[PDB]
Design a binder for this molecule. Structure first.
Ligand SMILES: Nc1ncnc2c1ncn2[C@@H]1O[C@H](COP(=O)(O)OP(=O)(O)O)[C@@H](O)[C@H]1O
Ligand SMILES: [Mg+2]
Length: 302
């Protein structure tokens, strides 16, 4: 159903340089926020990613995919639907986790690599796979096609959906979309995997469809006044919160239509779908408030 994880990023350069204190500790799957009384939260996984040298507990990109990606991918081969959301403060590690860098590929490249490896393994004259990708951006409840404002009618009228046949292919679209792309919008990478089995006369005898929606959410931080985007983002994120919580609690009412994001992903949120959320947070004292907020959001969803 619903899996919730928290990933703790390293100190950034500024925090390192300026000796900002660490206020986040971890204990197995508990997160302890020390005051800048200690607060303790429990999750399905906690990824402590502060320092590669501490092998005893460091979680690299490979670890995140093993614990959150592999299962979600398998789910799509099973013919079911799934979403993965990265949620948290700007600079906390949402994009690093979802897409990653050229040197540290994240969830999306690993998942696509795994996907094509598996399809190329199982494909033959009697069964085929069709892989289609869309990449869109939701900013202020308006949708933009990152593979080119599209109207919401639940479908996005005129949203490109492109057939890809190799990892390199699907890579050109990751690349293309990321260029055309950010901290104040949601980015949705969608894969449709269709697996068709054929009978003796080359007619269709079996077919499974699995959808994967991999989501880099808009930053969750509160804007500070020094003389609306944040408010619009808050509604969306609050609604996504209510949807995930309600599904996690599973006759209940689920408010899909209260936001463009949750409505467009209704198909992969309801039914027998699987949802995984990674709440990214800074370890540093100067982010306590936003870290605390992110932790409560993640706790609530679980
Ligand atoms: N777990 C991590 N390990 C190493 N570097 C990270 C990690 N998380 C984030 N970073 C780096 O910190 C910066 C902020 O990450 P990013 O994902 O862009 O933040 P966000 O998407 O949440 O705004 C990026 O340069 C990213 O490469
Ligand atoms: Mg980002």
């Amino acid at each position: 159903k619903v899996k919730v994880a928290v990933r703790i990023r390293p100190m950034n350069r500024r925090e390192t340089d300026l000796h900002t204190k660490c206020v986040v500790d971890v204990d197995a799957n508990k997160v302890i926020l020390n005051p800048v009384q200690p607060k303790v939260f429990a999750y399905d996984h906690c990824f402590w990613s502060m320092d590669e040298s501490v092998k005893e507990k460091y979680a690299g990109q490979d670890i995140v995919f093993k614990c959150l990606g592999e299962n979600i991918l398998q789910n799509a081969f099973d013919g079911y639907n799934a979403c993965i959301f990265a949620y948290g403060q700007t600079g906390s590690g949402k994009s690093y986790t979802m897409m990653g860098t050229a040197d540290q590929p994240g969830l999306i490249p690993r998942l696509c690599s795994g996907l094509f490896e598996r399809t190329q393994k199982e494909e033959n004259e009697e069964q085929s796979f069709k892989v289609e990708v869309s990449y869109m951006e939701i900013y202020n409840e308006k949708v933009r096609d990152l593979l080119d404002t599209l109207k919401v009618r639940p479908y996005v009228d005129g949203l490109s959906k492109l057939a890809v046949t190799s990892y390199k292919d699907i890579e050109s679209l990751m690349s293309e979309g990321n260029k055309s792309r950010s901290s104040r919008s949601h980015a949705v990478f969608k894969i449709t995997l269709t697996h068709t089995l054929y009978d003796v006369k080359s007619g269709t005898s079996g077919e499974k469809v699995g959808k994967l929606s991999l989501v880099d959410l808009a930053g969750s931080e509160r804007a500070t006044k020094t003389g609306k985007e944040g408010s619009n983002i808050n509604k969306s994120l609050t609604t996504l919160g209510l949807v995930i919580s309600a599904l996690a609690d599973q006759n209940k009412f689920v408010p899909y239509r209260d936001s463009v994001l949750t409505w467009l992903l209704k198909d992969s949120l309801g039914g027998n779908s699987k949802t995984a959320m990674v709440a990214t947070v800074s370890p540093a004292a100067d982010n306590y408030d936003e870290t605390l907020s992110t932790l409560r959001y993640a706790d609530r969803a679980k």
